Design a protein around this ligand. Structure first.
Ligand SMILES: C[As](C)(=O)[O-]
Ligand SMILES: C[As](C)(=O)[O-]
Ligand SMILES: [Zn+2]
Ligand SMILES: [Zn+2]
Ligand SMILES: [Zn+2]
Ligand SMILES: [Zn+2]
Ligand SMILES: [Zn+2]
Length: 76
C-alpha cells in the first residue's frame, strides 16, 4: 500500500473526520457517508442536483477510505 494508506495517513483521516464531527463509535460505512454528505448539504446541493451528486460521491469515497483505514465497519 502506497504512502496514502499507512497508519499515519489514516491518522490524519481520523483526525479530519473527528474535527468535522462526522465520525462516531461503532459506525458503519454507510452511516459515515450520510454524515459526511449531510455536512455539505445546503444551497448548492439543493439548487443543483449534480453538485448534490458530487457531494455524495465524495462522501462515498471518504467513507471507503475510512473503511480501509479501519475507521468504520464494513456494511452488512
Ligand atoms: C480510541 As477512539 C476515542 O478514536 O474511538
Ligand atoms: C475504529 As475507532 C472510531 O474506535 O478509532
Ligand atoms: Zn474507538
Ligand atoms: Zn455520481
Ligand atoms: Zn441523496
Ligand atoms: Zn464504495
Ligand atoms: Zn479512533
Amino acid at each position: 500500500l502506497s504512502p496514502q494508506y499507512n497508519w499515519v495517513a489514516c491518522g490524519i483521516l481520523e483526525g479530519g473526520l473527528k474535527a468535522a464531527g462526522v465520525l462516531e463509535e461503532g459506525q458503519y460505512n454507510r452511516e459515515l457517508a450520510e454524515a459526511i454528505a449531510a455536512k455539505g448539504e445546503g444551497f448548492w446541493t439543493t439548487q443543483f442536483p449534480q453538485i448534490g451528486d458530487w457531494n455524495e460521491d465524495q462522501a462515498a469515497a471518504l467513507a471507503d477510505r475510512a473503511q480501509t483505514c479501519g475507521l468504520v465497519k464494513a456494511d452488512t
